């Protein structure tokens, strides 16, 4: 519910230098046509999607991956820190540790690293090769900023760790590291703003579990759905459309009755109505750190959440 | 403020053993052959009162044996030692024990070994009897149960000299002091703290006699008034999390307890005034904390600590 | 042939390695019971030392009465009784309002899993009250902990609580408190034919109680009922156990009223099957591995009317 003021200083720099900047890998050089897949600089779709919106003749660049998206993930990691500490058997990562092993100081550093997580993006390109390049860019920006301003806070091995977290390196598991796990999970929660019911509730494949089943399996239905409703309220606080949910429709989405019944068993019946986007709240979230943070601190957190610092 | 999962899988595996092998079983020194009267001291095989107190309680048709010295009581003491491990690090000159060490000299490994030992501390009980001879028999039973388990399953973690030392902590032989070793000191303190669930205001705040300090005053003089009081409130909150009655506190009532103005006044400048309301017992939470390690642990990891537990 | 879900067999493997293959621990001299000296040992009843293990080809097979072969047989019984309830106009209505036919093919899998744990908490063959309820509460909590960590993707939390309470068989829950518990209890009851007398199997103890197969007749009729009876007897045989002879002729000579043996021959009809005696290596192969136990049981033909649903 609260963020350290030094986290917000780094937030201000990241907004000015990156999250407010236009996408550059845009335009005709970066259109994609799958039958001539190498005719351009793009080798997959998405470079020209929602490059910006205009709110009251101000231009808001990278609206899907801007200040508000980035700051919401920092509230997600602070909440899931407490949720993980309420579990008897928090998930153990490939490094031997759980989210409950992170200190209150570790979560400050992790918040700083989340500021850079998508800061290296140059379009909304989605395909694998663009994704790993943009994350490399974010990781390099993080290393540079931290090694110059944040050595009083980050040791050298922590800079390497959190940069490897931002990089999302080829061959690292989702849960390679407790730090990187909490970071991927915070990013995952925010995908609810724009993914289909199938991705949010059923999992896009037979193996995959889906965003909300993942929260329920990690924190139980009670805490997990608390978190899902809290993120949905963070959407609204920052003007984004809040999708409706209807577990009635899931049997009609094209998925084998197999995966649907499993998804309804995990999640339970859910019928909650949507909300519409709001241009003014969008603009206050997107254009200033003070604007975004002030809209986010005033949203109530779950009853069980008692933030430490 | 949740403390979170602080005990590693190895410690929980031991806790499952201690529950399955000892803390879940009926007390056995309990029938007519263990009643007692000081006026026919050796009519039965008991030599003091208490063998038939609180053998079990029934909660929603489930029978919970040894509710006073069961799983919930044992687990809570592991949480107190973790909290007091941090508190001793906020202290200039923590107490130096007969081994020449303090609580602040404990490593994270020592705390893990100590937690394992605490799992057995009262696991050798065969009744609620706490008169001299039954007390020392039951703690020696606990020590031997710990030695048997450790020598078969924990030799990659306890050296042979460590199994002897921790066994000695559990035994609590006559002649042994509170503070022979830093580890045992901490074990005794965690046990002491849980006594607030069932002891009178005089033992908790003023002291049994003119000599002994009493439970909360002992916390206060080891950790300061502020850390001390936080530990007290934390323990009280753990009673509620495992469904146990939490006694009220009324520092106003202490002159009206029939003990000298001498002793009562000193207890109110150490502790300061205190008015905290009690809370009844809860049977659902009591059963959930009593019949499984998962239920008891899951209930306890949730509970807030003071913020200073988290800062290092 | 009848089939089990691969995820049920995976849990069946876990339950063999972790419980069903482990020796009983409430055994030996400290659990022997002598009725003349009721307070001599830890036991408050008889049976702790009955049939701790048998020896096949100098291999020691622990808990042979309540091991892998009994447990897996009960899973096959509930599968068959599910379809058998599916064939009845007004199948029995349990205290929760549901019948066995109200369960889905997916519920049966969850029930199958819960059945694996039904006697897995036993620490001896003791069956007197206090021992029976401790053992079923052990098995219930061992189901809980396993489900809550490896099965949240298949069990809801309400479902875990429900199936745990079925395994627990709490005091004051009726045989038919839930449709789930009813099916679980009925499957255990079928397997008691392997070891109990003609009076329990056909006439009952008292004036109020039905026999084991008068019960299967009253629920599924006479053809469906005794079809189930013979399928069980045939699962005994495939798992090496002695198949007692049946003789309706002897039933008067049993020292119980013509009242009851009258009812039995009306309900069951006349019936006389010759017995068959046990087989060590069919007992050993059904006792020592999931693969050996499953492989033996899938090869027994099901009755004509049984068409099992499972494909996913």
mmCIF file with all atom_site columns, C-alpha atoms in Angstrom, chain B residues 126-194:
data_model
loop_
_atom_site.group_PDB
_atom_site.id
_atom_site.type_symbol
_atom_site.label_atom_id
_atom_site.label_alt_id
_atom_site.label_comp_id
_atom_site.label_asym_id
_atom_site.label_entity_id
_atom_site.label_seq_id
_atom_site.pdbx_PDB_ins_code
_atom_site.Cartn_x
_atom_site.Cartn_y
_atom_site.Cartn_z
_atom_site.occupancy
_atom_site.B_iso_or_equiv
_atom_site.pdbx_formal_charge
_atom_site.auth_seq_id
_atom_site.auth_comp_id
_atom_site.auth_asym_id
_atom_site.auth_atom_id
_atom_site.pdbx_PDB_model_num
ATOM 1  C CA . UNK B 1 126 ? 2.751  -39.198 30.371 1.00 0.00 ? 126 UNK B CA 1
ATOM 2  C CA . UNK B 1 127 ? 0.348  -36.989 32.354 1.00 0.00 ? 127 UNK B CA 1
ATOM 3  C CA . UNK B 1 128 ? -0.070 -33.384 33.461 1.00 0.00 ? 128 UNK B CA 1
ATOM 4  C CA . UNK B 1 129 ? 1.787  -34.280 36.660 1.00 0.00 ? 129 UNK B CA 1
ATOM 5  C CA . UNK B 1 130 ? 4.408  -31.628 37.371 1.00 0.00 ? 130 UNK B CA 1
ATOM 6  C CA . UNK B 1 131 ? 5.507  -32.404 40.921 1.00 0.00 ? 131 UNK B CA 1
ATOM 7  C CA . UNK B 1 132 ? 9.269  -32.951 41.225 1.00 0.00 ? 132 UNK B CA 1
ATOM 8  C CA . UNK B 1 133 ? 9.738  -36.635 40.408 1.00 0.00 ? 133 UNK B CA 1
ATOM 9  C CA . UNK B 1 134 ? 7.196  -36.791 37.601 1.00 0.00 ? 134 UNK B CA 1
ATOM 10 C CA . UNK B 1 135 ? 8.639  -33.625 36.024 1.00 0.00 ? 135 UNK B CA 1
ATOM 11 C CA . UNK B 1 136 ? 12.181 -34.986 35.905 1.00 0.00 ? 136 UNK B CA 1
ATOM 12 C CA . UNK B 1 137 ? 11.054 -38.442 34.707 1.00 0.00 ? 137 UNK B CA 1
ATOM 13 C CA . UNK B 1 138 ? 9.040  -36.964 31.819 1.00 0.00 ? 138 UNK B CA 1
ATOM 14 C CA . UNK B 1 139 ? 11.814 -34.603 30.699 1.00 0.00 ? 139 UNK B CA 1
ATOM 15 C CA . UNK B 1 140 ? 14.321 -37.473 30.751 1.00 0.00 ? 140 UNK B CA 1
ATOM 16 C CA . UNK B 1 141 ? 11.876 -39.499 28.633 1.00 0.00 ? 141 UNK B CA 1
ATOM 17 C CA . UNK B 1 142 ? 11.767 -36.575 26.207 1.00 0.00 ? 142 UNK B CA 1
ATOM 18 C CA . UNK B 1 143 ? 15.567 -36.355 26.085 1.00 0.00 ? 143 UNK B CA 1
ATOM 19 C CA . UNK B 1 144 ? 15.858 -40.089 25.295 1.00 0.00 ? 144 UNK B CA 1
ATOM 20 C CA . UNK B 1 145 ? 13.164 -39.876 22.611 1.00 0.00 ? 145 UNK B CA 1
ATOM 21 C CA . UNK B 1 146 ? 15.161 -37.023 21.079 1.00 0.00 ? 146 UNK B CA 1
ATOM 22 C CA . UNK B 1 147 ? 18.433 -39.012 21.248 1.00 0.00 ? 147 UNK B CA 1
ATOM 23 C CA . UNK B 1 148 ? 16.838 -42.043 19.596 1.00 0.00 ? 148 UNK B CA 1
ATOM 24 C CA . UNK B 1 149 ? 15.390 -40.015 16.716 1.00 0.00 ? 149 UNK B CA 1
ATOM 25 C CA . UNK B 1 150 ? 18.508 -37.893 16.163 1.00 0.00 ? 150 UNK B CA 1
ATOM 26 C CA . UNK B 1 151 ? 20.999 -40.811 16.187 1.00 0.00 ? 151 UNK B CA 1
ATOM 27 C CA . UNK B 1 152 ? 18.947 -42.652 13.555 1.00 0.00 ? 152 UNK B CA 1
ATOM 28 C CA . UNK B 1 153 ? 17.804 -39.776 11.312 1.00 0.00 ? 153 UNK B CA 1
ATOM 29 C CA . UNK B 1 154 ? 19.769 -36.597 12.107 1.00 0.00 ? 154 UNK B CA 1
ATOM 30 C CA . UNK B 1 155 ? 23.449 -37.575 12.127 1.00 0.00 ? 155 UNK B CA 1
ATOM 31 C CA . UNK B 1 156 ? 24.168 -35.390 9.047  1.00 0.00 ? 156 UNK B CA 1
ATOM 32 C CA . UNK B 1 157 ? 23.129 -32.399 11.196 1.00 0.00 ? 157 UNK B CA 1
ATOM 33 C CA . UNK B 1 158 ? 23.880 -33.180 14.856 1.00 0.00 ? 158 UNK B CA 1
ATOM 34 C CA . UNK B 1 159 ? 27.382 -34.222 15.771 1.00 0.00 ? 159 UNK B CA 1
ATOM 35 C CA . UNK B 1 160 ? 27.489 -36.875 18.495 1.00 0.00 ? 160 UNK B CA 1
ATOM 36 C CA . UNK B 1 161 ? 28.580 -34.180 20.970 1.00 0.00 ? 161 UNK B CA 1
ATOM 37 C CA . UNK B 1 162 ? 25.638 -32.013 19.830 1.00 0.00 ? 162 UNK B CA 1
ATOM 38 C CA . UNK B 1 163 ? 23.077 -34.800 20.431 1.00 0.00 ? 163 UNK B CA 1
ATOM 39 C CA . UNK B 1 164 ? 24.429 -35.100 24.004 1.00 0.00 ? 164 UNK B CA 1
ATOM 40 C CA . UNK B 1 165 ? 24.204 -31.330 24.603 1.00 0.00 ? 165 UNK B CA 1
ATOM 41 C CA . UNK B 1 166 ? 20.682 -30.938 23.266 1.00 0.00 ? 166 UNK B CA 1
ATOM 42 C CA . UNK B 1 167 ? 19.526 -34.059 25.100 1.00 0.00 ? 167 UNK B CA 1
ATOM 43 C CA . UNK B 1 168 ? 20.891 -32.488 28.270 1.00 0.00 ? 168 UNK B CA 1
ATOM 44 C CA . UNK B 1 169 ? 18.798 -29.366 27.518 1.00 0.00 ? 169 UNK B CA 1
ATOM 45 C CA . UNK B 1 170 ? 15.593 -31.402 27.286 1.00 0.00 ? 170 UNK B CA 1
ATOM 46 C CA . UNK B 1 171 ? 16.440 -33.472 30.392 1.00 0.00 ? 171 UNK B CA 1
ATOM 47 C CA . UNK B 1 172 ? 16.758 -30.414 32.663 1.00 0.00 ? 172 UNK B CA 1
ATOM 48 C CA . UNK B 1 173 ? 18.425 -32.474 35.391 1.00 0.00 ? 173 UNK B CA 1
ATOM 49 C CA . UNK B 1 174 ? 18.299 -31.267 38.983 1.00 0.00 ? 174 UNK B CA 1
ATOM 50 C CA . UNK B 1 175 ? 21.361 -29.135 39.546 1.00 0.00 ? 175 UNK B CA 1
ATOM 51 C CA . UNK B 1 176 ? 21.281 -27.759 35.993 1.00 0.00 ? 176 UNK B CA 1
ATOM 52 C CA . UNK B 1 177 ? 20.681 -24.029 35.836 1.00 0.00 ? 177 UNK B CA 1
ATOM 53 C CA . UNK B 1 178 ? 18.437 -22.004 33.545 1.00 0.00 ? 178 UNK B CA 1
ATOM 54 C CA . UNK B 1 179 ? 21.514 -20.675 31.756 1.00 0.00 ? 179 UNK B CA 1
ATOM 55 C CA . UNK B 1 180 ? 24.059 -23.482 31.442 1.00 0.00 ? 180 UNK B CA 1
ATOM 56 C CA . UNK B 1 181 ? 24.164 -22.994 27.644 1.00 0.00 ? 181 UNK B CA 1
ATOM 57 C CA . UNK B 1 182 ? 22.822 -20.234 25.399 1.00 0.00 ? 182 UNK B CA 1
ATOM 58 C CA . UNK B 1 183 ? 20.662 -22.742 23.479 1.00 0.00 ? 183 UNK B CA 1
ATOM 59 C CA . UNK B 1 184 ? 19.103 -24.224 26.619 1.00 0.00 ? 184 UNK B CA 1
ATOM 60 C CA . UNK B 1 185 ? 18.569 -20.758 28.057 1.00 0.00 ? 185 UNK B CA 1
ATOM 61 C CA . UNK B 1 186 ? 16.547 -19.895 24.960 1.00 0.00 ? 186 UNK B CA 1
ATOM 62 C CA . UNK B 1 187 ? 14.573 -23.155 25.172 1.00 0.00 ? 187 UNK B CA 1
ATOM 63 C CA . UNK B 1 188 ? 13.650 -22.468 28.811 1.00 0.00 ? 188 UNK B CA 1
ATOM 64 C CA . UNK B 1 189 ? 12.657 -18.885 27.969 1.00 0.00 ? 189 UNK B CA 1
ATOM 65 C CA . UNK B 1 190 ? 10.358 -19.987 25.140 1.00 0.00 ? 190 UNK B CA 1
ATOM 66 C CA . UNK B 1 191 ? 8.732  -22.490 27.532 1.00 0.00 ? 191 UNK B CA 1
ATOM 67 C CA . UNK B 1 192 ? 8.414  -19.797 30.187 1.00 0.00 ? 192 UNK B CA 1
ATOM 68 C CA . UNK B 1 193 ? 6.587  -17.443 27.799 1.00 0.00 ? 193 UNK B CA 1
ATOM 69 C CA . UNK B 1 194 ? 3.844  -20.004 27.020 1.00 0.00 ? 194 UNK B CA 1
#
